[PDB]
Amino acid sequence: AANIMRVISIKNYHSDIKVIVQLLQYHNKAYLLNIPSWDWKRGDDAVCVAELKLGFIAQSCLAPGFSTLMANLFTMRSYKPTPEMSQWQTDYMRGTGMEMYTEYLSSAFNALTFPEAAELCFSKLKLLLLAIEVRESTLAINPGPKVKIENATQGFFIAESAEEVKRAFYYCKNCHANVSDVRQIKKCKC
């Protein structure tokens, strides 16, 4: 109730400020959906802790451990081994160092099918490509061979940092990236 009154106050002062609010209960989300000036199409957004928590847990009922995979994927962490760490913990901790990112695919991806773009990103760039924002626009997760990458497509990635994902934007014409020692990918594509 306090956080809903805060959004009401913020949007009474100026309707068009993007408000991101944390809610503890799902039924209270109806109240701010009914605010006259709330609009998800501007990116007004209610992060409901109960909705998310139980949906991450429901996902482990379908795919055991997926709550941990997906929760680690949404906070910024960097790997950093220690000599006291057992080898299973080094594998786990190396996985925790990865989180979700968004980038524009380079012109070299245009008119590939999504599976070809995902093979390319993985096998060359060391980047895991999950999904693409298809042009209004819609988010497509692992879409089949029936979809092409457009020009200027946003792609969703799993990687160790944003500066690692930028390889998918800088990715050269094939003429300028045959060697595949991936640190060498850089903006000099032409």
Using DSSP's 3-state secondary structure scheme, residue 63 falls into coil
Other residues' Cβ atoms within 10 Å of the Cβ of residue 133: 15
Is 5 among the residues that bind Ca ion (CB under 5 A)? no
Sign (positive or negative) of CA dihedral 38, 46, 5, 32:
positive
Residue placing its CB nearer to other proteins in the complex, 126 or 189: 126
CB of 131 to other proteins, least distance (A): 6
Residue 132 · residue 109 · CB < 8 Å: no
Instruction: Looking at residues 139 to 178 of the shown chain, list those that interact with Ca ion (rule: CB under 5 A).
Output: 160
Q: Report the amino acid identity of residue 160.
A: E
Is 12 among the residues that bind Ca ion (CB under 5 A)? yes
Residue placing its CB nearer to other proteins in the complex, 47 or 111: 47
* Interaction mask 71-90, other proteins, x per CB under 8 A: xxxxxxx----------xx-
* Interaction mask 72-101, Ca ion, x per CB under 5 A: ------x------------------x----
Is 145 among the residues that bind other proteins (CB under 8 A)? yes
CB of 190 to other proteins, least distance (A): 28
Residue placing its CB nearer to other proteins in the complex, 3 or 189: 3
183 is in an annotated binding site: no
For the residues of 71-138, what is the DSSP string, one character each? Answer: HHTTS-------TTS-HHHHHHHHHHT-EEEEEEPPGGGTT-BHHHHHHHHHHTT--EEEEEEE---E
99 is in an annotated binding site: yes
Establish how many alpha carbons lie within 13 A of residue 58's alpha carbon, considering only the half-sphere containing its beta carbon. Answer: 6
Instruction: Looking at residues 1 to 40 of the shown chain, list those that interact with other proteins (rule: CB under 8 A).
Output: 1-2, 4-5, 8-9, 12-13, 15, 20, 22, 29-31, 33-37, 40
168 Cβ neighbours under 8 A, 6+ residues apart: 103, 104, 105, 106, 109, 121, 125, 127, 129, 155, 157
Is 58 among the residues that bind other proteins (CB under 8 A)? yes
- Residues annotated within a binding site: 12, 77, 97, 99, 160
- Residues annotated within a binding site for Ca(2+): 12, 77, 97, 99, 160
